[PDB]
């Protein structure tokens with residue numbers, strides 16, 4: 156099954172519902188089910204990559220596409236005061252779904268340090 | 271910006287890696303045992319103004335970032351962060367990727 160069987164691969168294949176912001180041939184943007192900000196969504200590749208630590212050199216454009224889509228969706232969602240983009244890697248980074256995903260959070264003042 | 275001075279080697283920074291299109295160096299106010307930045311040499315002021323033909327460059331920052339993290343021993347994981355604007359807490363208007371690890375990172379991420 157293309158994209159794998161994590162919750163994210165199932166969302167890609169429309170097997171589990173999600174609230175979809177934007178979709179193209181390379182990625183999917185949808186809202187997070189447990190938001191940590193007034194606006195909190197995810198941008199994920201449709202290609203399954205388990206984590207950024209195993210991304211290949213040829214995934215450069217796909218990862219860059221994740222951030223460009225992230226900043227376009229943020230603008231379309233009216234996050235004009237700013238937002239924060241987060242990729243987590245592994246146990247210390249806080250990763251709980253092993254499919255590469257970009258968090259985009261906004262609608263409030265984000266604090267420092269970022270966790 | 272001060273990051274421009276760092277790229278031009280006009281002020282010192284503890285450089286981790288450099289190529290023809292980006293620079294990685296330790297952050298001067300670290301928030302984790304390992305905290306570095308990956309910045310492009312092109313002056314993109316902020317992610318919100320990045321163009322579509324910057325997708326390869328922005329992705330290059332992340333691949334460099336994950337390669338430096340491995341080289342710096344972050345085998346238990348790390349967090350990558352890009353801030354935009356006042357709500358995102360962006361501190362310097364030259365786009366930069368934060369990489370933090372060496373300790374458990376918490377949720378929410380700020």
Ligand SMILES: Nc1nc(=O)c2ncn([C@@H]3O[C@H](COC(=O)NCCc4c[nH]c5ccccc45)[C@@H](O)[C@H]3O)c2[nH]1
Nearest residue numbers: 162173186187188189243248249250251252375376377
């Ligand atoms: N729309 C949607 N549908 C789902 O079924 C679903 N299942 C999980 N998720 C979202 O994926 C995201 C998973 O991304 C992460 O791994 N982020 C870190 C959260 C986290 C889990 N454990 C941690 C430990 C330390 C620090 C952070 C964490 C979460 O925000 C979660 O709400 C979902 N989102």
Ligand SMILES: [Cl-]
Nearest residue numbers: 271273274364
């Ligand atoms: Cl600059």
Ligand SMILES: [Cl-]
Nearest residue numbers: 353359360361
């Ligand atoms: Cl910043």
